[PDB]
Design a protein around this ligand. Structure first.
Ligand SMILES: O=C(CCSc1nc(-c2ccccc2)cc(=O)[nH]1)NO
Ligand SMILES: O=C(CCSc1nc(-c2ccccc2)cc(=O)[nH]1)NO
Ligand SMILES: [Mn+2]
Ligand SMILES: [Mn+2]
Ligand SMILES: [Mn+2]
Ligand SMILES: [Mn+2]
Ligand SMILES: [Zn+2]
Ligand SMILES: [Zn+2]
Length: 455
C-alpha cells in the first residue's frame, strides 16, 4: 500500500559445468535476463573464494550521502575509517535506528523504511560509505598475485569469476584497450551501511556490470530492462528535469534516488532482488539499476564487454554524440586496436569485430564524401591515439575523435568530428584539414585480417 515490492528478478543456480565459463553462462541466460535488466547468480555450493582481512589495517575515506528522493547526487570519482571503526559505526547506526539487534531487522522492513525516509521531507538522514578502486590501503576482496598465497587463494587466482580477471579474459572485448580507463576496467570496492545507496544509472558505454557481495548484510537491487531505458529517462525527466541539464564533464553527472513504484506506475517494468553474501548480480547493457544496503557489507564490481555488446557499444557512442556527452574511450580506436591484433584474437571475437568494423568503414566512407563536398580538400594523417583524451574531443558534441576530425590553423588544437564541420570557426572550408587515422585503403586489409582469422 505504501510500498509494493517489484517482482523478483531471475535467479540462476548454475552447475559447476555451466558456471565454469562466465562468458558462455552469461550468453546462455541472456535471452531471459535481458528482459529483466538484472539477474542474480548463485555459484555452485563449493565455489567459495577465501575472504580474509585485518579489519584494523584496511583504511578508507568515507563519502557522505543525504537520502532524499529526486534530490541531485553526483556520480562518484576515483577523514578516515578503518574497516573496523566503519563497521562499529554502521552497526550502531542500524541498531539505534530500529532499537533492534543489528542483524535482526527484517529485510522487508528496511526496504519499506528506506522508501519512507527518502520521501519524507521532515526526515534528514545522512549515511556514509566507501567507494573506490583497489589500493595498497584497501585491496581487492579476491586473491591477486604478489606474499605467499595459501593454496585456497591460489585456486581462485585465475577464476573467471574473480573480478580482477574478468576484464583481461579472452572473450572480453574491453581487454586490450590500451587507453587509461582505470575507473572502468578495474573493479570498484564498496563498503556499505544500512540505507547507503546507489542512484539510478546505467554503465558507461552501456557495458555489463558484474557485482559480487563478499560478506555482510544483503544488498537490495532494483533493475529495469535495457529496452525500457528511454521510458525510464522520460519519467525521470518529467519529475526531476534539473538532472537532465547539460553536464560540463564526466565529474558532474547527476543521478538520483527514485521509488520504483513511481516507475511501475508509469508502466516502466522494474525488478528487485536481495543480493546476499556469496552471490553475484549481473546488469545487462543499458539496464538501469539502483539499490541500497541492508547493513554493513563489502562488495566488488566491474564493468565488462562481451561480443554480444559490440553493436550496442557503437549505438551508445552515437547516442552520446546526439546528447553531447563525453566518452570514456574511443569505440573506433578499440575496434582498430583489435583489428591490428587479428591473429591473436579469439575467432568468435574476430568475427564480431569484423562486422562492427564493416559498419564503421562504410559510415566513415560516407562522412568523408560529405566533408569533401563541403569544400575540405587538404588532409594529413594524424595519430589521434597519442593525444590526451581531453585534447581530441569534438568542440560541438564532445565525442572522442579517432577515425577523423577537422582542424583549422585559425583555432590551434581545436577539433570537430565530421558531423560538425560547420561548428569549428568562420573560416571557409578550404582552410580546413581533414585529419585521419587511416585511409580507406589502410582499413580494408585490417578488416580482411579479421575475416581470415574468423575463417
Ligand atoms: O528465478 C528463477 C528462475 C530463473 S529461470 C527463468 N526466470 C524467469 C523470470 C524470473 C523472474 C522474473 C522474470 C522472469 C523466466 C524464465 O523463463 N526463466 N528461480 O527462482
Ligand atoms: O552500480 C553498480 C552497483 C554496485 S554495488 C554498490 N554500488 C555503490 C555505489 C555505486 C556508484 C557510486 C557510488 C556507490 C555503493 C554500494 O554500497 N554498492 N554496479 O553496476
Ligand atoms: Mn551481526
Ligand atoms: Mn552500476
Ligand atoms: Mn547537433
Ligand atoms: Mn551542449
Ligand atoms: Zn562532433
Ligand atoms: Zn579557422
Amino acid at each position: 500500500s505504501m510500498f509494493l515490492p517489484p517482482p523478483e528478478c531471475p535467479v540462476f543456480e548454475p552447475s559447476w559445468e555451466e558456471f565454469a565459463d562466465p562468458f558462455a553462462f552469461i550468453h546462455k541466460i541472456r535471452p531471459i535476463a535481458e528482459q529483466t535488466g538484472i539477474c542474480k547468480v548463485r555459484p555452485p555450493p563449493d565455489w567459495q573464494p577465501p575472504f580474509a582481512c585485518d579489519v584494523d589495517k584496511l583504511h578508507f575515506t568515507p563519502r557522505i550521502q543525504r537520502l532524499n528522493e529526486l534530490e541531485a547526487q553526483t556520480r562518484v570519482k576515483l577523514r578516515d575509517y578503518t574497516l573496523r571503526t566503519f563497521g562499529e559505526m554502521a552497526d550502531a547506526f542500524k541498531s539505534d535506528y530500529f532499537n533492534m539487534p543489528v542483524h535482526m531487522v527484517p529485510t522487508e522492513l528496511v526496504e519499506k523504511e528506506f522508501w519512507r525516509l527518502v520521501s519524507t521531507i521532515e526526515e534528514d538522514v545522512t549515511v556514509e560509505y566507501g567507494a573506490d578502486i583497489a589500493s595498497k590501503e584497501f585491496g581487492s576482496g579476491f586473491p591477486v598475485r604478489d606474499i605467499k598465497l595459501s593454496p585456497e587463494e591460489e585456486e581462485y587466482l585465475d577464476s573467471g569469476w574473480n573480478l580482477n580477471n574478468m576484464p583481461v579474459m579472452e572473450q572480453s572485448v574491453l581487454a586490450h584497450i590500451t587507453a587509461d580507463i582505470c575507473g572502468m576496467k578495474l573493479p570498484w570496492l564498496y563498503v556499505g551501511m544500512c540505507f547507503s545507496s546507489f542512484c539510478w544509472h546505467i554503465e558507461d558505454h552501456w557495458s555489463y556490470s558484474i557485482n559480487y557481495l563478499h560478506w555482510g548484510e544483503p544488498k537490495t537491487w532494483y533493475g529495469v530492462p535495457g529496452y525500457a531505458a528511454e521510458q525510464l529517462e522520460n519519467v525521470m525527466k518529467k519529475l526531476a528535469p534539473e538532472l537532465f541539464v547539460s553536464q560540463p564533464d564526466l565529474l558532474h553527472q547527476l543521478v538520483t534516488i527514485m521509488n520504483p513504484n513511481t516507475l511501475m506506475t508509469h508502466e516502466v517494468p522494474v525488478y528487485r532482488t536481495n543480493q546476499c553474501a556469496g552471490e553475484f548480480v549481473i546488469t545487462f547493457p543499458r539496464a538501469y539499476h539502483s539499490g541500497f544496503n541492508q547493513g554493513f557489507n563489502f562488495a566488488e564490481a566491474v564493468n565488462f564487454c562481451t561480443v554480444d555488446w559490440l553493436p550496442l557499444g557503437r549505438q551508445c557512442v552515437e547516442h552520446y554524440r546526439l546528447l553531447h556527452r563525453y566518452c570514456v574511450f574511443s569505440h573506433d580506436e578499440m575496434i582498430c586496436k583489435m583489428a591490428s591484433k587479428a591473429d591473436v584474437l579469439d575467432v568468435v571475437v574476430a568475427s564480431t569485430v569484423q562486422k562492427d568494423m564493416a559498419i564503421m568503414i562504410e559510415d566513415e566512407k560516407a562522412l568523408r564524401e560529405t566533408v569533401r563536398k563541403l569544400g575540405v580538400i587538404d588532409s594529413e594523417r594524424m595519430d589521434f591515439e597519442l593525444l590526451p583524451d581531453d585534447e581530441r574531443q569534438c568542440v560541438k558534441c564532445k565525442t572522442t575523435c579517432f577515425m577523423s576530425a577537422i582542424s583549422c590553423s585559425c583555432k590551434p588544437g581545436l577539433l570537430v568530428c565530421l558531423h560538425h564541420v560547420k561548428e569549428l570557426c568562420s573560416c571557409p572550408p578550404y582552410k580546413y584539414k581533414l585529419r585521419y587515422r587511416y585511409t580507406l585503403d589502410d582499413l580494408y586489409p585490417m578488416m580482411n585480417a579479421l575475416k581470415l582469422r574468423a575463417e
